[PDB]
Amino acid sequence: CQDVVQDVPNVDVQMLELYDRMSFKDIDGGVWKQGWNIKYDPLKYNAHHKLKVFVVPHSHNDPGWIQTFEEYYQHDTKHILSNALRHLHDNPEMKFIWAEISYFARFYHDLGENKKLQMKSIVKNGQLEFVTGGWVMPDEANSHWRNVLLQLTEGQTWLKQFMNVTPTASWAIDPFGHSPTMPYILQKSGFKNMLIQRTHYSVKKELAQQRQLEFLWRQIWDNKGDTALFTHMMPFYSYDIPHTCGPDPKVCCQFDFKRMGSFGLSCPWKVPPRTISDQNVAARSDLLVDQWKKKAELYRTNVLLIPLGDDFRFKQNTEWDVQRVNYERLFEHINSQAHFNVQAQFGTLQEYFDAVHQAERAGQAEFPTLSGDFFTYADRSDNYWSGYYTSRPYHKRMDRVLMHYVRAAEMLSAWHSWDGMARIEERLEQARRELSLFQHHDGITGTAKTHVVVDYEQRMQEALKACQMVMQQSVYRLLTKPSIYSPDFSFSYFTLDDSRWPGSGVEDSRTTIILGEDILPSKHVVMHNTLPHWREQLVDFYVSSPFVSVTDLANNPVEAQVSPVWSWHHDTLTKTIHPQGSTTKYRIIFKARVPPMGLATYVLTISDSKPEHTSYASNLLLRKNPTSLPLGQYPEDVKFGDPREISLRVGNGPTLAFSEQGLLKSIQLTQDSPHVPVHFKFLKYGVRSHGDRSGAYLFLPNGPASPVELGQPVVLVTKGKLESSVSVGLPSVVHQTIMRGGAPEIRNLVDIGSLDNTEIVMRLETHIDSGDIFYTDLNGLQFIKRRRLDKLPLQANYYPIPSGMFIEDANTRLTLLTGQPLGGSSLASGELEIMQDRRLASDDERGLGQGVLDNKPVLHIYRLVLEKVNNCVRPSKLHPAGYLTSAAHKASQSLLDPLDKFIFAENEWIGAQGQFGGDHPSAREDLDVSVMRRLTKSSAKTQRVGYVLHRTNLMQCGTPEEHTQKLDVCHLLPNVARCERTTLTFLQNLEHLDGMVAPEVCPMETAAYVSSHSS
């Protein structure tokens, strides 16, 4: 195993280093506005060294943006594909590349057999080529790596089954900035090449000057280079025709033949395209070949890529003709005029890469190595695209909830083979596809029109219902005596109970467990743990009486705590935000201990009085002018007091101090230790009154944030033996700090209401001497070092926080983990900040055509981990990566993959069992079974189950933590007959494993295995 901490990789381009050196000046470079006037030596190419040009027709099809997926399919994409089939069939030398498999599968299943066969033929002969082959072209900032893999696998599994092809070249022309998580996943999925486009204009200039636009992109910690993937970065401002033929858009636009008028398009540079004829082909060729030779100067080989396309192009038959015929006339002339020393033709992306590598092998070029990322993107001036790291945060949080539900549904149902009548495969495919669709770069990014966001939300709700159905049928099968099990596959044996989604204050949708002497004495509940290690975690349920006790299925009492159900209300009468307690429902909390990838059953029983093993939280409402807060049968009266500072400690955990406004002020790790200043504060950013306006994509603040005026907020303190909390009703945010004995949990119920042109940020102020350094994660996969640069504007220093961020000095580290992707930064030493929501009245000129005024209440969740790190073995100062500690990693897992809770629906569960998975191996803490998926339906003689195993890298800080079992996923199901290592999409077998044992992976590695069972 490579050491991912102690060996700084030696690369030619390291993006953090490049950023420290770059000036980022935005000067007018001439016709290539953000470059320079390219010059080339006409004698560079000759009879023995020609420039080979591949013109690659393409059509960017967004799976929802200005219209919904289905609206675009009906209005545009079905015609593009139907006409591509006809035109490619009839013109053998014409080529076309296709990226979005969600649209291709929607089209293909509606085709008659005759056309399916014609389609398969143009794919087999190479005219139509799939690039990447994912369900969508995903966002790379907010997406979790698990969902990037899910959507890639959904598209490629469909392509293997129906087109018999697996792309090895990726095409990502539109995500707003790029992440090294892509080459990581692609290289472990059989890819050999990838292409990107949206990188900062200053980066394109810098790399173009050094001919470093093609590089071997390896991970930041990869010393050896085995993760490297050849990458081509396009050089210009856009992937449209004016910015893909060469440096001068006024010239290139004249070679977009759809812009002469009848299609309602024109050239903004004021010179229109002209139909190629024998009288102008020599002059037109001279102009075009000159653009090509200038673009070729930016690269190292004599093979040039010229994309030919734009958004939803190649629709009309007349458009196919106009582009094809004109380019055919240019090719015939250019290729026959020896003086140009060019051979040009339509080609595919793979053809381009194959020719580049043939040139490389011929010794004509060596490529530089590169590590780092390409955030935060700016396409021009100070227009940095950091706004979409936060836009539509409700759906960003929903993405993470569904991510976990899909994993849990696939894993719970994988243990058995199911009859077709159970509709398990059907519901899982629906769920995987709706979550995969949302990975689109206008889905999770929050950059689609309002009605499109509604469509994605509706699709995800249907996916959550599908997951619940699969999960509850699976739990019933796994925990019911076999000879008693009698399923009705349409019945709800259990309902899921989720405490954090949509969340208290967002939707009152949790069901209360109704117990009563005259109706039902007790109720069974079941917890599932999708992680491969034993886990204890407090769980809570709503119950109709405070006199409830808990037992495990051996009838052993389990200590529990009962607290009131508090809801916050913006009282329009008193103009205050304050809590109301239920007089009919209560919360019961207790620790559930669940096996690795297993289930544990508990029983809640009502009694007429306080149970011996159930305690009751005290409650203290701090506000001047209080009024009573009756709580029905709750046995402890609420206490009142004027606002004041307070201190709380649960268990032997940390002691937290709060201001009189209910916000954290300090954390004391242990009895002796100091009270470390850690101050939460809410501030607001505004919008510029002159110049460019912030919108769904861009963050263009009108200066540093200003504190939210808090007034005298109402603060609620609940103190219990198992769980305590401090909640406060601030303007636009009900802020809650929860303590269960370890790192606190923070929950923000964010309702920006009608505050136009406002972005609400949550900031942490500490003493930590972090300087200008902070760390943020990439797709929940790795932490990258960031350096705040005062030479760049504030918005450029905002980065995606898909799952966590931290600051540290020699001795102390503060890590904030998130349950949803949001934007954030460290704008001053000792600070961390993360945006909560943004409401913007104006459009930001990137095509969306509306502001962001459809905000809705969202419950954001976090864990806050303050730790001493002076004893940790950390990377050297020159290493570009950072790594979490065990506690921060576990805190992240508690947010992303919590225990699932099931409430038995009927009155009695006959044949109920107490546990499942007690014999499953409890793997080392840094290892996860990211995916468990049965790959075969019930009619297959040989069943196959796929596993994706991911091992992260945790810092060594002297905490032994040992004695763990080896996890061999290939023996998790009985009767294993074969075990193979496969690509991450499970589509190619890479290694036949001896003894049918799947070995564990190295830190920072991800491997996939498929076990075969004869059963």
Residues at the interface with Zn ion (CB under 5 A): 62, 174
Q: Are 764 and 832 in contact (CB under 8 A)?
A: yes
Q: Select the binding partner of residue 311 from ligand GB2, Zn ion, none (C-beta < 5 to 8 A, by kind).
A: ligand GB2
In the complex with ligand GB2, which residue's Cβ is closer, 238 or 938?
Answer: 238
Least separation, in Å, of the C-beta of 171 and Zn ion? 12
CB nearer to Zn ion: give 60 or 333.
Answer: 60
Q: How far is Cα 978 from Cα 586, in angstroms, rounded to an integer?
A: 51
User: Who contacts 705 (Cβ-Cβ below 8 Å, separation ≥6)?
Assistant: 683, 684, 685, 759, 761, 763, 833
Cα distances (angstroms) measured from residue 673 to each of 166, 248, 655: 57, 64, 10
By CB under 6 A, is residue 442 in contact with ligand GB2? yes
CB-based contacts of 258-264 (< 8 A; 24+ apart in sequence): 258/313, 258/319, 258/322, 258/323, 260/322, 262/318, 263/316, 263/318, 263/319
Piece of the chain touching ligand GB2 by CB under 6 A; list 41-49, 60-68, 873-881, 904-912 = 60-68
Residue 847 lies near ligand GB2 (rule: CB under 6 A): yes
Measured between alpha carbons, how far is 823 from 821 in angstroms, rounded to an integer? 7
Selection from ligand GB2, Zn ion, none that 847 binds (CB < 5 to 8 A by kind) is ligand GB2
Which of 87, 95, 404, 441: binder of ligand GB2 (CB under 6 A)? 441
213-232 residues in contact with ligand GB2 (CB under 6 A) are none
Between 174 and 928, CB nearer to ligand GB2: 174
928 binds, among Zn ion, ligand GB2, none (CB under 5 to 8 A by kind): none
Cβ of residue 66: shortest distance to Zn ion, in angstroms?
Answer: 10
Which listed residue (62, 76, 174, 809) is catalytic?
Answer: 174
Pick from 13, 53, 62, 818 the residue near ligand GB2 by CB under 6 A. 62
Q: Please say if 62 is a catalytic residue.
A: no
Q: What is the SS3 assignment for 931-987?
A: EEEECCCCCCCCEEEEEEEEECCCCECCCCCCCCCCCCHHHCCCCEEEEEEECCCCC
843 touches ligand GB2 (CB under 6 A): no
* Residues 152-191, interacting with ligand GB2 (CB under 6 A): 174
Breaks (C-N over 2.5 A) in the chain follow: none
Q: Which two tokens stand for residue 16?
A: 């953090």
Footprint on residues 910-929 left by ligand GB2 (CB under 6 A): none
Can you tell me which of 17, 311, 462, 769 binds ligand GB2, judged by CB under 6 A?
Answer: 311
Contact residue for ligand GB2 among 19, 24, 65, 685 (CB under 6 A): 65
Q: Which is nearer to ligand GB2, 446 or 611 (CB)?
A: 446
CB of residue 177 vs ligand GB2: minimum separation in angstroms? 12
Q: What angle do CA 350, 238, 842 make, to 5 degrees?
A: 135
Choose between 184 and 377: whose C-beta lies nearer to ligand GB2: 377
Distance in Å, CB of 172 to ligand GB2, minimum = 12
Name the minimum Å distance from CB 700 to ligand GB2: 17
Separation of alpha carbons 128 and 104, rounded Å: 12
> Closest-CB residue for ligand GB2?
847
Exposure string of 78-89, with b = 16+ CB inside 10 Å and e = fewer, is: bbbbbbbbebbb
Single out the segment in contact with ligand GB2 by CB under 6 A; choices: 59-67, 458-466, 664-672, 698-706.
59-67
* Beta-bridge partner residues of 97: 58, 129
Nearest C-alpha neighbor of 370 from the set 211, 236, 247: 211
327 binds ligand GB2, rule: CB under 6 A = no
Q: Is 628 exposed, middle or buried (0-12, 13-18, 19+ CB in 10 A)?
A: exposed
What, of Zn ion, ligand GB2, none, does residue 190 touch, CB below 5 to 8 Å by kind? none
SS3 540: strand
Q: Which does 914 bind (CB under 5 to 8 A by kind): Zn ion, ligand GB2, none?
A: none
Check: CB of residue 226 under 8 Å from CB of residue 246: no
In the complex, minimum distance from the CB of residue 537 to ligand GB2, in angstroms, rounded to a whole number: 39
Closer CB to Zn ion, 96 or 493, in the complex: 96
Closest distance of CB 447 from Zn ion, Å: 9
Min dist. Cβ of residue 447 to ligand GB2 (A): 6
In DSSP notation, 762-812 reads EEEEE----TTEEEEEETTTEEEEEE--TTS-GGGG-EEESSEEEEE-SSE
Those residues whose C-beta lies under 8 Å from the C-beta of residue 26, and which sit 6 or more positions away, are 34, 201, 202, 380, 381
CB 162 within 8 A of CB 156: no
Q: Give the binding range for ligand GB2 (CB under 6 A) out of 58-66, 263-271, 625-633, 852-860.
A: 58-66
Q: Which residues are catalytically annotated?
A: 174
Chain contacts with ligand GB2 (rule: CB under 6 A) = 60, 62, 65, 174, 238, 240, 311, 441-442, 847
